[PDB]
Design a protein around this nucleic acid. Sequence first.
RNA 1: AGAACCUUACCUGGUCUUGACAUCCACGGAAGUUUUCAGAGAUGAGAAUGUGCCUUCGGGAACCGUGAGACAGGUGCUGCAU
Lengths: 50, 100, 127, 206, 154, 98, 50
Amino acid sequence: VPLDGGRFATSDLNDLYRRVINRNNRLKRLLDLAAPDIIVRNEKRMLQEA
Amino acid sequence: AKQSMKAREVKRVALADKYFAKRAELKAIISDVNASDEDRWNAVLKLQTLPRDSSPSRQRNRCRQTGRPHGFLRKFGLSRIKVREAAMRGEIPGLKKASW
Amino acid sequence: NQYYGTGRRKSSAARVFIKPGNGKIVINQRSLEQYFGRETARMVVRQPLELVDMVEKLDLYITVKGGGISGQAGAIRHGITRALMEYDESLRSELRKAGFVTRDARQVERKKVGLRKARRRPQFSKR
Amino acid sequence: GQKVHPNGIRLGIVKPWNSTWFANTKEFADNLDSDFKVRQYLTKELAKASVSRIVIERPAKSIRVTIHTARPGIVIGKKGEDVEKLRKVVADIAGVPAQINIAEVRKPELDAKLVADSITSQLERRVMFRRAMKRAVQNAMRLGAKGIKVEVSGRLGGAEIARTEWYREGRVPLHTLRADIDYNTSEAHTTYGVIGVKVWIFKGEI
Amino acid sequence: KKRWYVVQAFSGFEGRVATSLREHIKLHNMEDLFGEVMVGYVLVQMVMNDASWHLVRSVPRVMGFIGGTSDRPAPISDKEVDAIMNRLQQVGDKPRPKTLFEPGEMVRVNDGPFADFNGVVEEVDYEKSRLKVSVSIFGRATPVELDFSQVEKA
Amino acid sequence: RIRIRLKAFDHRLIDQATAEIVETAKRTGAQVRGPIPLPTRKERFTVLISPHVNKDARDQYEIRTHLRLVDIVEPTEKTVDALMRLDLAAGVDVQISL
Amino acid sequence: ERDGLFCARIFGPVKDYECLCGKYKRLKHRGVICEKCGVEVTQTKVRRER
RNA sequence: AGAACCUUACCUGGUCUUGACAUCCACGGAAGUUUUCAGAGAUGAGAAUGUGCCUUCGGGAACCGUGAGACAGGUGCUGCAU
């Protein structure tokens, strides 16, 4: 829901879900053209922490 | 019309669909100007070890119904007899005894 | 203003635009003389004019396209005679008394089957 | 022999085609051969069913048969059961989904195809050919047909020299192209040889 | 011999990290210890001394190397680094050039009235940035022109 | 804006069917160029009729395919679906190029 | 968004019985998934349970 | 309305016979694919690989072969049986 002004005051769970989906899309891209082990280990580790 | 000669036609379209359009490349550009040495000369040797079938010139284009080799029509796939008996029935769309 | 008559001889299609003015003939951005004006009895491009309007105080703008020479020469002639529409049957009557108004509908024949040239049959022998 | 086919001369005039679809040059042949496959397979198994004509439509990668019979209750079985026993096999040969339609003819003695099988079925059941022929002429004029002409030719009667006898009634004008003359041909494998039946039915003047 | 290593930067300031890295090299003049710098990850041709490691981590807006451990960080598996770099480059063309190119290839429509339909691209127009694909409407493949972003590759 | 090129074998059908393809458009899009006929392709096949000798008895055949154009004016989404998705008359080809 | 954190087809229509924009603005066909943008056709509290 | 082989039915020679083409039976193997030698080729001997679909899995049948008899095949004859 927005506030008086109009800027949407967004919840915290939308930040969490949007982070997990951004990282998951990056990791899938790192499965198609993909990239070396160290890269996908950091990518999966950032998804785990997300 | 000689059911063996119908069966000899149906095996030739299979070999033309397994080898050639895929192994006509050996004659396509490997018989064109490049390193035209024994690399080319091997490829001119290497397409005779393919069967004597599987080239599209071996195909006869017999009738689809009667298998008659002469009198074929490459719009319908029938012979000239089987197109006329069908057309006067109304098995072939938009066709009639016309005159101009 | 501006007047018209078509003419359609022998699968050639003429567009004759008649207007009073000069006495020139323009045929498809060529003059008459350079198009076929030294060729093969051109008289039919003027045969209605030397019949009635000897003065020829009207310039002809002709654009014909289509088939051969004499048919194009004839389709012009049927075009001009139909283009005397403001100068009508007061003087198009004497046009009909010299023919001159028919399409001359005479197409070539279609080659029939069996034969060779739509009437010429290929030389049978009795034995 | 010397007469033109009465239906094939009238396709653009009165009688519609028995197969109406468009196809370009690339797909004209394999439509036509699959169209032949539905016609030979249906009459392969609808021999009891008294089937006259099978019209074919193709709406954009679809096949739509339309079967004209005089026994619509037999082909459906009960509640359209054996219709989709025919749909299963015509989906095989055509490769696309298949909607099946059916329209009855309540006057089977008025179309050329069924009066042929009113004759050509009996001739192998050792009926005298003049009896089956003349009954077919009487049956059509009884039911109000404006013309009828039926011809049988072959080794009929168990002879050795073939004949060609024919019976007619009323008006059957084969040069008046306004006429919707129904014409159909059939054959009869007897013991001595085949018998060709040719029946013309003149329905109306326009 | 100089082997490759992977550096993590603040994602978005990557060109500025690369420029500051080249400048720190030419400041602390360990010129014989760095080969190149390739472009959120920065590829560095390097050798491993602890001095050069402190140099790269003293470059600003750099988190650290990515490897098995932080004592002796790990060179480069280069399993699909080229393909990742290829994607980065392709993206440019894929967006800017948007070369609509497909034949007999099936595509997917998610825009206009043809949304939620698939079809094949009989003709392609990279110059006009338009794909010629027909969508089976009532069975009839309705050949329509859709943009690369208007349809998805199938 | 959108070329509508449609082909069929029957002239009384293709020209009947072009009346409603603009009636489903001028009801909503309210601007069409106009029904444009196109010169028909007549393919002839004249071929023998006997199963043997007498190569003088032939029967001339001809299959006439026609083409029509209407080339609708307005590319508003409503009109697009009322033509692209709404195709009628089985046995009539219709192909569109936007 | 077409298919984002806050989708239409995956969850439901924001407005009650309104599909999306130009489709179903009365009470007759509740359910038809319009082509303009894939969307469910239900009430306003249907997204709270999905 | 189109024979270099093909077509092709003719000829020499090399071959196989329940058969190249259909239905049926019993077995065994997914089917398929790659490649080598011997051979004029047909074929013969292989050598590798694949090992999918429905499940009562003691499965069955899309599919390749081997054996079974029904049969299949005939552009063989007679247009003066049709």
